[PDB]
């Protein structure tokens, strides 16, 4: 594991000397804004399971995952997490995880960006299962404060986004109204199929975390023109969220 | 996957030219007209017996025996027979199950029309790469149970309805676990149904589900003697499809 | 499976003729130090094991102790976590005392306390029985209506009067979020830990009586080194007495 990380790191190092401070995990508007972009295809990167883009956003050096991994694709949880460990050793200090989510909270609207304040793991998989390298992180990571209080406060002082709890589920089929009523009872505001594994990895290796959700739809039980409109709304709202997060870090 | 389906389909086609409209999944068979039986042990890529024939003049494909994740099967393996049914030509699936009644109004021996499902198995037969020719990457599960099929069934039978929660098993639940499931809104608990329903929705089949209550669930306080009620439910479902 | 059991059993037999009545499953003190005529067998030497077994007597009663246990977060198959319990059955035990470390969800529980677990919720979504079943070992579909032996628990409680709670088993290894813990509280859990469920399912399967004790190590998420040392000592001595009582009243 540590050998795989080193191998991938060396590969990257030979293509960019950037010392990025922030990893950004995305599923145009924002990527197109990156300054002096260096692109590295996932297909060329040792031990990867898409493209990494390195460069600067508001003068700050960043590493962007243009494309991410999901347990519904068949990936082992550790594979999903590996790019995050790679980021740590390339030198990042924080991770912005974005996701697409169904709104369980009826006050949320499709197209909105929600600051995720906490997570629930309903995937019942964990990238840490198996023997642990204490050089990478502890056996039993504290998940008492997943979202960095200061980072979120500085972001919120600028953007004043809605906040919500995110529940991660395996997918790939969507949820039933019965399932969604369960999640509502259990306190979730948003449901998606990503985020949890990479957030667990990030906390493990000691990175700071913020998470944004883009509401793609109201969850089950709760026009193409409308998907067009909401897709446009989210793109520009997420660009501002992401830029703010980079700038205040 | 599509190759395994085609191989199984050719096998079946060489034994029955029936174009069945409905797949019936059973753990009534004696009533089937002109029955053609095919052992699961002979069918390419199967994990029991298929019975083809007619019920109230309508052609059907029956799974006399089904698969459960508690047996050790991969979810995709549990789902395969359903994809095979699709390509043999069925349009609907009637899934039966045995269930424990969490709703204390239900009594052992009753047939309940299942109105929705909760997946508490945390397994999905779709995990892994998806063939878009079979069905979409992200199936809609907003209306699993076909509203019209269920309405026509209910107009005849007026069954109780309930929410079915699928669990792995094979050990039964503790009273603490059953109180969880009650809080979460489940009326019935069983160890089947969910994987084959997910597969059906994926490949675009209509679905109805019936549960036979075999017992009150843990903490609250037979499929053979219920065979008559289930026979009527099944026959109604076929007839109104 | 039955062949693996017999192989391990023969290995043990050749080192101890004890006919132990009770298996005690511990995480790793004064309790082990108290065992009489202790015979120690390393897990590394035991056929088909995934720590040390210690055989001997506690208040004159012969016992088999697992000094060290297994967790699904380590990467073990559920059936592997369960195997020592089957082995215990065939060595002759009739009862199991499962200990664990747990986070207190119930705000009336304090770190360092021992709680008598009255029932379990499996939120690991793994089961050691998945796959084909040997009916000589136990039934295909074990009843879990009364996991904790009513009489054993009653005789323990008559002596100790411990708090009781519902234990939820989860995979880990990362700890829970405050959101996750509010889920568990709503679902009726008093304690959360990462062990117990697989071995208890196994035990019920093969027909052993079961009692479970939790040692509160901390309040769960969202609910001092000196205080760690204070509660650690408190727990040790409290668990010794719980364990000794359980053996004595069996
Ligand atoms: N699980 C789930 N994931 C999503 N990703 C985007 N929308 C949704 C949804 O409604 N449910
Ligand atoms: N899980 C579960 N499955 C069942 N199948 C039939 N009865 C029951 C029950 O009580 N619980
Ligand atoms: N899952 C879980 N396990 C534990 N083991 C000891 N303390 C804890 C806790 O707070 N949560
Ligand atoms: Mg060995």
XYZ file of C-alpha atoms and ligand atoms in Angstrom:
774
model
C 0.000 0.000 0.000
C 2.651 2.456 1.030
C 4.691 1.101 -1.937
C 1.795 1.668 -4.352
C 1.425 5.226 -3.019
C 5.132 5.951 -3.489
C 5.013 4.521 -7.026
C 2.074 6.679 -8.031
C 3.683 9.712 -6.303
C 6.877 9.357 -8.314
C 4.904 9.221 -11.517
C 3.040 12.402 -10.680
C 6.241 14.148 -9.530
C 7.769 13.620 -12.909
C 4.865 15.537 -14.474
C 4.207 18.372 -12.001
C 6.236 19.984 -9.233
C 3.081 21.592 -7.825
C 2.717 21.180 -4.081
C -1.078 21.217 -3.943
C -2.755 22.095 -0.641
C -6.226 20.876 -1.548
C -7.654 17.752 -3.292
C -10.946 18.409 -5.060
C -13.105 15.380 -5.912
C -15.516 15.992 -8.801
C -17.814 13.674 -10.772
C -16.209 22.171 -17.351
C -17.026 25.631 -15.761
C -14.558 25.137 -12.879
C -11.950 22.842 -14.513
C -11.826 25.330 -17.401
C -10.851 28.039 -14.853
C -7.709 26.158 -13.583
C -4.454 28.076 -14.198
C -1.411 26.392 -15.799
C -3.333 23.091 -15.822
C -1.355 19.856 -15.941
C -3.505 16.840 -16.843
C -2.672 13.238 -15.978
C -5.021 10.430 -17.152
C -6.040 7.928 -14.500
C -5.247 5.216 -17.070
C -1.561 6.160 -16.874
C -1.234 6.421 -13.105
C 0.263 3.437 -11.249
C -2.328 1.529 -9.169
C -5.275 3.691 -10.029
C -8.627 1.965 -10.485
C -10.943 10.190 -15.665
C -8.034 12.575 -15.150
C -6.132 14.458 -12.441
C -5.803 18.147 -13.078
C -3.136 20.066 -11.236
C -2.884 23.886 -11.334
C -4.159 26.920 -9.467
C -7.563 28.197 -8.502
C -7.454 31.759 -7.180
C -3.648 31.509 -7.077
C -3.784 28.531 -4.706
C -2.334 25.204 -5.966
C -4.829 22.361 -6.166
C -5.215 18.775 -7.306
C -8.534 17.986 -8.951
C -10.072 14.570 -9.565
C -12.014 15.056 -12.804
C -13.921 11.779 -12.387
C -14.303 9.699 -9.228
C -15.022 6.104 -8.144
C -18.131 4.415 -6.738
C -18.708 1.141 -4.951
C -21.674 0.400 -7.335
C -19.046 0.083 -10.188
C -17.575 -2.926 -8.459
C -14.527 -1.295 -6.892
C -13.139 -2.582 -3.654
C -13.541 0.156 -0.937
C -9.715 0.442 -0.583
C -9.429 1.159 -4.324
C -11.984 3.949 -4.043
C -9.862 5.420 -1.217
C -6.388 5.060 -2.769
C -6.419 8.401 -4.703
C -6.992 10.175 -1.383
C -3.903 8.563 0.179
C -2.001 9.514 -2.943
C -3.128 13.145 -2.472
C -1.943 13.135 1.144
C 1.562 12.078 0.093
C 1.622 14.488 -2.838
C 1.124 16.977 -0.018
C -2.523 18.048 0.275
C -3.886 19.227 3.641
C -7.564 19.372 2.826
C -10.116 17.663 0.612
C -13.281 19.101 -0.909
C -15.608 16.191 -1.775
C -18.521 17.060 -4.054
C -21.374 14.703 -4.809
C -24.718 14.437 -6.556
C -27.590 13.764 -4.130
C -31.333 13.258 -3.888
C -33.015 15.711 -1.503
C -34.856 14.031 1.352
C -35.418 17.402 3.103
C -38.348 19.026 1.221
C -36.885 22.484 1.764
C -34.049 21.612 -0.592
C -34.579 22.199 -4.293
C -32.927 20.592 -7.341
C -29.992 22.731 -8.481
C -29.058 23.783 -4.920
C -25.693 23.377 -3.246
C -25.838 22.124 0.321
C -22.984 22.236 2.795
C -22.942 18.751 4.254
C -22.500 18.997 8.006
C -22.251 15.235 8.794
C -22.448 11.791 7.145
C -24.170 8.499 7.758
C -22.577 5.345 6.287
C -25.393 3.089 4.990
C -23.058 1.352 2.575
C -21.745 -1.020 5.274
C -18.373 -1.150 3.639
C -15.249 0.562 4.956
C -11.929 1.095 3.057
C -10.040 0.435 6.301
C -11.171 -3.142 6.737
C -8.119 -5.377 6.906
C -4.700 -4.802 8.510
C -3.751 -1.176 9.252
C -0.490 0.719 8.557
C -0.089 3.062 11.512
C 2.267 5.181 9.374
C -0.700 5.999 7.175
C -3.192 6.558 10.047
C -4.637 5.033 13.257
C -6.455 1.687 13.625
C -9.678 3.407 14.864
C -10.104 6.944 13.402
C -12.193 9.499 15.304
C -15.219 10.534 13.258
C -16.583 12.895 15.905
C -15.952 15.969 13.687
C -15.687 14.852 10.143
C -16.230 18.367 8.620
C -13.570 20.889 9.581
C -15.343 23.476 11.761
C -13.132 26.435 10.724
C -13.162 25.648 6.976
C -16.980 25.316 7.029
C -17.412 28.472 9.085
C -15.301 30.564 6.673
C -17.186 29.065 3.704
C -20.549 29.699 5.331
C -19.667 33.282 6.285
C -19.306 33.949 2.546
C -22.001 31.683 1.043
C -24.682 31.014 3.688
C -25.631 27.654 2.170
C -28.273 25.289 3.535
C -26.817 22.505 5.592
C -27.749 18.876 5.781
C -26.858 15.340 6.742
C -25.754 13.074 3.946
C -26.423 9.325 3.930
C -24.284 7.205 1.628
C -25.804 4.167 0.018
C -24.459 1.531 -2.365
C -26.831 1.908 -5.309
C -26.907 1.740 -8.221
C -30.689 1.410 -8.209
C -32.431 4.434 -6.669
C -34.333 4.162 -3.408
C -37.932 3.305 -2.830
C -40.337 5.661 -1.104
C -40.287 3.167 1.849
C -36.459 3.371 1.971
C -36.565 7.169 1.792
C -39.069 7.341 4.678
C -36.529 5.258 6.655
C -33.782 7.733 5.822
C -36.018 10.668 6.747
C -36.761 9.041 10.122
C -33.090 8.434 10.699
C -32.287 12.109 10.107
C -30.778 12.211 6.599
C -31.330 15.288 4.382
C -29.544 13.987 1.293
C -28.897 10.575 -0.273
C -26.097 9.656 -2.652
C -23.855 6.824 -3.747
C -20.408 8.371 -3.214
C -18.459 10.300 -0.549
C -18.376 8.004 2.445
C -15.404 5.828 1.445
C -13.137 8.727 0.410
C -14.162 10.739 3.529
C -13.270 7.795 5.787
C -9.852 7.582 4.044
C -9.316 11.376 4.416
C -10.012 11.396 8.148
C -7.749 8.289 8.499
C -4.810 9.948 6.862
C -5.404 13.227 8.720
C -6.758 15.528 6.037
C -9.269 18.261 6.679
C -12.632 17.757 4.975
C -15.493 19.753 3.600
C -18.333 18.175 1.537
C -20.833 19.815 -0.847
C -23.900 18.182 -2.321
C -25.557 19.169 -5.527
C -29.277 18.360 -5.419
C -30.086 16.602 -8.672
C -33.643 15.674 -7.685
C -36.095 15.165 -4.863
C -35.720 11.652 -3.454
C -38.365 8.968 -4.147
C -41.798 9.511 -2.676
C -41.035 13.192 -2.196
C -39.367 18.010 -17.603
C -36.216 17.753 -19.658
C -36.438 21.559 -19.630
C -36.277 21.328 -15.816
C -33.203 18.975 -15.840
C -31.621 21.488 -18.243
C -32.407 24.406 -15.919
C -31.302 22.671 -12.703
C -28.113 21.321 -14.351
C -27.247 24.905 -15.436
C -28.031 26.263 -11.949
C -25.821 23.684 -10.177
C -22.770 24.168 -12.443
C -22.332 27.864 -11.573
C -23.355 27.491 -7.930
C -20.816 24.690 -7.480
C -18.081 26.685 -9.174
C -18.584 29.463 -6.585
C -18.722 26.937 -3.682
C -15.524 25.258 -4.790
C -13.675 28.520 -5.403
C -14.739 29.872 -2.022
C -13.552 26.665 -0.302
C -10.137 26.911 -1.992
C -9.800 30.639 -1.240
C -10.699 30.446 2.489
C -8.655 27.290 3.228
C -23.777 -12.005 -19.083
C -25.768 -11.442 -22.240
C -23.916 -14.523 -23.598
C -24.919 -16.637 -20.598
C -28.528 -15.442 -21.032
C -28.579 -16.401 -24.745
C -27.072 -19.846 -23.932
C -29.716 -20.560 -21.289
C -32.431 -19.201 -23.612
C -31.433 -21.531 -26.474
C -31.547 -24.435 -24.059
C -35.036 -23.578 -22.940
C -36.250 -22.898 -26.515
C -35.303 -26.392 -27.561
C -37.673 -27.710 -24.864
C -40.665 -25.330 -24.956
C -41.936 -22.928 -27.602
C -44.153 -21.268 -25.040
C -43.990 -17.507 -25.079
C -44.717 -16.959 -21.398
C -46.020 -13.526 -20.296
C -45.378 -13.999 -16.581
C -42.590 -15.402 -14.416
C -43.748 -16.825 -11.105
C -41.169 -17.261 -8.311
C -42.074 -19.857 -5.704
C -40.226 -21.408 -2.838
C -50.786 -24.463 -7.915
C -47.963 -26.266 -9.775
C -50.270 -29.304 -9.999
C -52.868 -27.062 -11.756
C -50.484 -26.037 -14.638
C -51.754 -27.116 -18.091
C -49.465 -28.999 -20.526
C -46.555 -28.610 -18.089
C -43.015 -28.738 -19.399
C -40.418 -29.166 -16.641
C -36.739 -28.206 -16.854
C -34.383 -29.002 -13.953
C -32.184 -26.151 -12.775
C -29.316 -28.692 -12.778
C -29.543 -28.930 -16.574
C -29.921 -25.240 -17.439
C -26.732 -23.416 -18.537
C -25.431 -20.919 -15.934
C -28.083 -21.570 -13.348
C -27.016 -21.510 -9.691
C -35.276 -26.865 -8.303
C -37.107 -26.824 -11.631
C -38.755 -24.472 -14.159
C -42.287 -25.348 -15.071
C -43.717 -23.909 -18.274
C -47.437 -24.232 -19.195
C -50.684 -22.354 -18.766
C -52.657 -21.171 -15.781
C -56.157 -20.009 -16.707
C -55.206 -20.321 -20.360
C -52.356 -17.824 -19.974
C -48.798 -19.025 -20.638
C -46.467 -18.843 -17.647
C -42.971 -19.705 -16.502
C -42.737 -20.937 -12.920
C -39.655 -21.165 -10.676
C -40.409 -24.166 -8.478
C -37.584 -23.312 -6.076
C -35.690 -20.043 -5.746
C -32.362 -18.722 -4.496
C -31.351 -16.859 -1.357
C -28.284 -14.934 -0.432
C -28.085 -16.842 2.894
C -27.161 -19.913 0.792
C -23.927 -18.220 -0.301
C -25.032 -17.102 -3.778
C -23.637 -13.969 -5.345
C -26.519 -11.446 -5.800
C -26.006 -11.517 -9.591
C -26.502 -15.275 -9.516
C -29.804 -14.898 -7.577
C -30.945 -12.395 -10.236
C -29.890 -14.340 -13.414
C -33.086 -16.416 -13.761
C -35.052 -13.179 -13.939
C -32.978 -11.808 -16.793
C -33.395 -15.209 -18.475
C -37.204 -14.908 -18.088
C -37.093 -11.428 -19.673
C -35.384 -12.808 -22.797
C -37.653 -15.827 -22.973
C -40.271 -13.079 -23.263
C -42.024 -12.474 -19.943
C -43.500 -9.088 -19.223
C -44.345 -9.427 -15.544
C -43.115 -11.188 -12.462
C -45.053 -12.407 -9.486
C -42.595 -12.912 -6.607
C -43.883 -14.843 -3.608
C -42.164 -15.147 -0.272
C -42.457 -16.465 3.244
C -42.451 -13.655 5.823
C -42.555 -12.866 9.504
C -45.339 -10.489 10.426
C -44.129 -7.379 12.205
C -47.617 -5.783 11.900
C -49.628 -7.413 14.744
C -52.815 -7.204 12.665
C -51.395 -9.830 10.322
C -51.981 -13.457 11.190
C -49.945 -16.537 10.201
C -51.474 -18.107 7.088
C -52.472 -14.756 5.565
C -51.489 -13.478 2.157
C -50.413 -9.876 2.096
C -50.030 -7.768 -1.022
C -46.626 -6.196 -0.643
C -46.851 -2.493 -1.597
C -43.172 -1.569 -1.207
C -39.779 -3.003 -0.217
C -36.898 -1.952 2.036
C -33.485 -3.463 1.221
C -31.762 -4.276 4.505
C -29.525 -6.866 2.843
C -27.049 -4.180 1.627
C -26.255 -6.232 -1.383
C -27.383 -5.381 -4.947
C -27.230 -7.678 -7.997
C -26.320 -4.647 -10.171
C -23.025 -3.860 -8.441
C -20.260 -3.927 -11.050
C -20.264 -2.817 -14.679
C -23.662 -2.346 -16.350
C -24.872 -3.511 -19.827
C -27.196 -0.783 -20.993
C -28.802 -3.285 -23.432
C -30.060 -5.164 -20.374
C -31.170 -2.035 -18.408
C -30.068 1.358 -17.100
C -27.098 2.156 -14.800
C -29.454 3.688 -12.130
C -32.909 2.033 -12.181
C -35.910 3.992 -10.832
C -37.428 2.296 -7.819
C -40.083 4.988 -7.214
C -42.944 2.557 -8.070
C -41.640 -0.971 -7.784
C -45.117 -2.552 -7.643
C -47.158 -2.060 -10.826
C -50.101 0.146 -9.803
C -52.557 -1.327 -12.359
C -51.680 -4.973 -11.783
C -52.005 -4.431 -7.978
C -55.322 -2.562 -8.422
C -56.849 -5.313 -10.536
C -55.608 -7.885 -8.020
C -57.018 -5.909 -5.101
C -60.337 -5.338 -6.736
C -60.821 -9.121 -6.698
C -59.053 -10.127 -3.481
C -58.973 -7.148 -1.127
C -55.796 -8.321 0.633
C -54.045 -6.563 3.469
C -51.072 -4.529 2.291
C -47.688 -4.114 3.830
C -44.041 -3.057 3.516
C -41.573 -5.868 3.180
C -38.048 -5.575 4.534
C -35.468 -7.971 3.057
C -32.717 -9.252 5.337
C -29.812 -11.613 4.780
C -30.543 -14.241 7.480
C -30.320 -17.170 7.877
C -30.651 -16.723 11.651
C -34.021 -15.133 12.572
C -34.267 -11.682 14.146
C -33.974 -10.627 17.739
C -36.851 -8.741 19.388
C -34.528 -5.659 19.419
C -34.012 -5.968 15.620
C -37.771 -6.445 15.058
C -38.448 -3.274 17.123
C -35.975 -1.466 14.815
C -37.825 -2.732 11.752
C -41.203 -1.711 13.236
C -39.826 1.777 13.879
C -38.605 1.917 10.322
C -42.097 1.055 9.023
C -41.740 -2.571 7.940
C -44.841 -4.820 8.182
C -43.114 -8.058 7.057
C -39.617 -9.498 7.242
C -38.081 -12.133 4.982
C -34.826 -13.330 3.456
C -35.749 -13.298 -0.241
C -37.410 -11.050 -2.789
C -35.178 -7.948 -2.883
C -32.462 -9.145 -5.305
C -34.869 -10.583 -7.895
C -37.140 -7.478 -7.645
C -34.149 -5.143 -8.237
C -33.252 -7.301 -11.297
C -36.858 -7.210 -12.601
C -37.076 -3.420 -12.339
C -33.686 -3.139 -14.036
C -34.744 -5.138 -17.086
C -38.112 -3.374 -17.228
C -40.495 -6.092 -16.006
C -43.719 -5.335 -14.200
C -43.743 -6.537 -10.599
C -46.180 -7.756 -7.999
C -45.183 -9.375 -4.683
C -47.190 -11.538 -2.281
C -46.117 -12.571 1.163
C -47.380 -15.567 3.068
C -47.155 -14.915 6.804
C -45.470 -17.956 8.299
C -45.204 -16.532 11.843
C -45.352 -13.444 13.984
C -41.849 -11.910 14.042
C -39.507 -12.092 17.054
C -40.799 -10.584 20.247
C -44.446 -10.384 19.121
C -45.554 -13.609 20.871
C -48.138 -23.123 7.889
C -46.897 -22.183 4.395
C -48.253 -25.662 3.545
C -51.712 -25.047 5.011
C -51.773 -21.629 3.265
C -51.355 -23.235 -0.145
C -54.948 -22.505 -1.009
C -54.906 -18.769 -0.408
C -51.671 -18.469 -2.330
C -53.096 -20.474 -5.183
C -55.978 -18.023 -5.478
C -53.640 -15.011 -5.248
C -51.357 -16.379 -7.922
C -54.200 -17.340 -10.226
C -55.832 -13.935 -9.860
C -52.522 -12.193 -10.673
C -52.093 -14.226 -13.846
C -55.723 -13.782 -14.847
C -55.807 -9.960 -14.503
C -52.346 -9.310 -15.995
C -15.750 -27.555 8.755
C -16.568 -30.474 10.982
C -13.120 -31.898 9.924
C -11.357 -28.646 10.854
C -13.125 -28.747 14.235
C -12.028 -32.336 14.951
C -8.456 -31.491 13.933
C -8.277 -28.505 16.285
C -10.033 -30.536 19.020
C -7.422 -33.321 18.827
C -4.669 -30.750 19.074
C -6.154 -29.273 22.200
C -6.936 -32.682 23.754
C -3.287 -33.562 23.531
C -2.493 -30.538 25.726
C -5.363 -30.472 28.257
C -7.907 -33.047 29.390
C -10.026 -30.334 30.981
C -13.697 -30.665 30.170
C -14.541 -26.936 30.315
C -18.181 -25.904 30.834
C -17.775 -22.293 29.784
C -15.971 -20.423 26.985
C -14.936 -16.894 27.944
C -14.177 -14.489 25.107
C -11.860 -11.609 26.148
C -10.062 -8.912 24.228
C -6.560 -9.734 25.558
C -5.345 -8.772 33.459
C -6.164 -9.979 37.020
C -8.769 -12.371 35.719
C -6.434 -14.460 33.549
C -3.834 -14.163 36.334
C -6.440 -15.767 38.696
C -6.914 -18.964 36.586
C -5.912 -22.162 38.471
C -3.578 -24.749 36.885
C -3.538 -22.699 33.661
C -2.693 -24.447 30.406
C -1.867 -22.012 27.581
C -2.152 -22.765 23.874
C -1.114 -20.149 21.304
C -3.571 -19.432 18.515
C -0.597 -19.606 16.110
C -0.281 -23.316 16.869
C -3.950 -24.307 16.720
C -5.084 -25.983 13.491
C -7.388 -23.718 11.450
C -7.337 -20.756 13.761
C -7.359 -17.288 12.233
C -3.665 -14.542 21.073
C -3.829 -17.606 23.307
C -6.386 -20.053 24.763
C -6.067 -20.470 28.513
C -7.663 -23.509 30.124
C -7.908 -23.970 33.916
C -10.359 -23.253 36.732
C -12.086 -20.168 38.035
C -13.728 -20.718 41.397
C -13.110 -24.457 40.969
C -15.095 -24.521 37.728
C -13.223 -25.575 34.581
C -13.162 -22.881 31.874
C -11.760 -22.137 28.426
C -10.636 -18.582 27.903
C -9.940 -16.764 24.620
C -7.247 -14.259 25.582
C -7.617 -12.319 22.346
C -10.544 -12.435 19.951
C -11.313 -11.675 16.303
C -13.071 -8.746 14.575
C -14.489 -8.353 11.091
C -12.621 -4.965 10.790
C -9.359 -7.002 10.751
C -10.440 -8.584 7.440
C -11.564 -11.943 8.808
C -14.342 -13.853 7.107
C -17.364 -14.100 9.474
C -17.051 -17.922 9.554
C -13.434 -17.566 10.689
C -14.473 -15.236 13.595
C -17.023 -17.922 14.563
C -14.785 -21.044 14.312
C -13.311 -20.876 17.883
C -16.863 -20.994 19.214
C -17.674 -24.172 17.333
C -14.367 -25.595 18.551
C -15.382 -24.724 22.146
C -18.701 -26.514 21.688
C -16.962 -29.750 20.696
C -14.340 -29.452 23.419
C -17.467 -29.590 25.537
C -18.527 -26.107 26.690
C -22.199 -25.450 27.448
C -22.100 -21.691 27.878
C -20.296 -18.649 26.533
C -19.504 -15.372 28.260
C -18.750 -12.785 25.526
C -17.101 -9.597 26.776
C -16.664 -6.482 24.660
C -15.522 -2.855 24.683
C -18.358 -0.449 23.866
C -19.290 3.175 23.432
C -22.181 4.285 25.620
C -25.096 5.690 23.676
C -27.271 5.686 26.797
C -26.162 8.876 28.673
C -26.804 7.147 32.034
C -23.925 4.782 31.329
C -20.514 5.986 32.421
C -17.034 4.957 31.123
C -15.619 2.159 33.296
C -19.013 0.553 33.961
C -19.974 -3.008 33.175
C -23.368 -3.448 31.556
C -25.295 -6.656 31.205
C -26.293 -6.809 27.539
C -29.904 -7.946 27.305
C -30.216 -8.099 23.502
C -28.200 -7.457 20.314
C -28.805 -5.635 17.027
C -26.666 -6.770 14.071
C -25.666 -3.728 12.005
C -22.668 -5.464 10.525
C -24.812 -7.088 7.806
C -22.564 -10.037 7.747
C -23.496 -13.479 9.186
C -21.110 -16.444 9.856
C -23.829 -18.897 8.761
C -24.082 -17.612 5.161
C -23.405 -20.516 2.830
C -24.323 -24.166 3.116
C -25.337 -25.483 6.562
C -24.281 -28.668 8.416
C -27.348 -29.695 10.358
C -25.062 -31.733 12.669
C -23.607 -28.462 13.815
C -26.912 -26.559 14.087
C -30.118 -25.595 12.258
C -30.400 -23.726 8.935
C -32.477 -20.972 10.613
C -31.514 -20.445 14.302
C -34.043 -18.857 16.643
C -32.710 -15.580 18.068
C -35.813 -14.799 20.160
C -33.861 -15.169 23.459
C -30.188 -14.837 22.765
C -29.230 -14.184 26.414
C -30.021 -17.072 28.714
C -32.763 -15.847 31.105
C -31.649 -18.002 34.084
C -27.925 -17.304 33.746
C -28.646 -13.528 33.543
C -31.088 -13.668 36.504
C -28.564 -15.429 38.753
C -25.838 -12.927 37.676
C -28.143 -9.955 38.293
C -29.324 -11.215 41.673
C -25.672 -10.876 42.767
C -24.454 -7.828 40.792
C -27.488 -5.672 39.856
C -25.737 -4.238 36.772
C -27.304 -1.839 34.345
C -28.782 -3.483 31.257
C -28.691 -2.328 27.650
C -29.068 -3.202 23.984
C -25.844 -3.680 22.076
C -25.529 -2.777 18.385
C -22.620 -4.442 16.514
C -21.036 -2.481 13.669
C -18.106 -3.199 11.370
C -15.787 -0.239 12.136
C -12.895 0.305 12.391
C -13.506 4.019 12.219
C -15.684 5.263 15.060
C -19.227 6.552 14.483
C -20.315 10.065 13.619
C -22.702 12.010 15.814
C -25.329 11.531 13.052
C -24.760 7.768 13.084
C -25.028 7.683 16.864
C -28.396 9.594 16.743
C -29.553 6.874 14.280
C -28.539 4.206 16.795
C -30.222 5.990 19.696
C -33.452 6.272 17.692
C -33.182 2.563 16.892
C -32.975 1.740 20.609
C -29.273 0.930 21.073
C -27.576 1.670 24.435
C -24.067 0.495 23.450
C -22.031 0.295 20.233
C -19.087 -1.919 19.459
C -17.335 -3.815 16.738
C -17.380 -7.416 18.037
C -19.822 -9.887 19.659
C -22.464 -10.363 16.968
C -20.663 -13.045 14.871
C -19.585 -15.225 17.789
C -23.041 -14.857 19.448
C -24.774 -15.962 16.229
C -22.417 -18.970 16.108
C -23.092 -19.801 19.767
C -26.844 -19.741 19.337
C -26.467 -21.891 16.157
C -24.572 -24.658 17.968
C -26.853 -24.493 20.985
C -24.692 -22.821 23.616
C -26.126 -20.669 26.397
C -24.968 -17.020 26.123
C -24.385 -14.043 28.369
C -22.737 -10.788 27.185
C -21.074 -8.034 29.197
C -19.996 -4.662 27.863
C -17.245 -2.541 29.309
C -18.001 1.131 28.568
C -14.744 2.596 27.290
C -16.243 5.999 26.293
C -19.449 7.915 25.566
C -20.312 7.499 21.908
C -19.848 10.326 19.344
C -21.805 13.481 20.144
C -22.827 12.229 23.620
C -7.985 13.159 30.311
C -5.268 10.511 30.356
C -5.865 10.431 34.088
C -9.518 9.615 33.513
C -8.525 6.890 31.052
C -6.351 5.375 33.751
C -9.173 5.815 36.291
C -11.837 4.093 34.213
C -9.487 1.386 32.909
C -8.705 0.197 36.443
C -12.346 0.493 37.434
C -13.403 -1.663 34.472
C -10.750 -4.326 35.075
C -11.814 -5.053 38.600
C -15.495 -4.719 37.766
C -15.126 -7.114 34.831
C -13.214 -9.582 36.974
C -16.118 -9.741 39.393
C -18.701 -9.943 36.572
C -16.826 -12.825 34.965
C -16.235 -14.658 38.200
C -19.928 -14.366 39.130
C -20.992 -15.635 35.716
C -18.746 -18.722 36.047
C -19.841 -19.354 39.636
C -23.627 -19.182 39.028
C -23.631 -21.134 35.750
N -28.965 7.158 -3.855
C -29.281 8.234 -4.592
N -28.246 8.802 -5.234
C -28.436 9.898 -5.964
N -27.546 10.613 -6.678
C -28.262 11.597 -7.255
N -29.588 11.501 -6.918
C -29.767 10.469 -6.098
C -30.891 9.783 -5.359
O -32.086 10.179 -5.414
N -30.559 8.691 -4.643
N -36.219 -12.784 8.458
C -37.319 -13.551 8.638
N -37.625 -14.342 7.612
C -38.732 -15.066 7.679
N -39.216 -15.916 6.751
C -40.304 -16.479 7.335
N -40.482 -16.030 8.613
C -39.524 -15.138 8.883
C -39.105 -14.246 9.999
O -39.688 -14.218 11.115
N -38.002 -13.511 9.793
N -18.279 0.955 17.263
C -17.729 1.415 18.424
N -16.922 0.523 19.041
C -16.316 0.815 20.198
N -15.485 0.055 20.943
C -15.151 0.818 22.020
N -15.741 2.039 21.941
C -16.494 2.107 20.829
C -17.390 3.093 20.110
O -17.599 4.257 20.581
N -17.961 2.670 18.935
Mg -2.615 -21.023 12.001
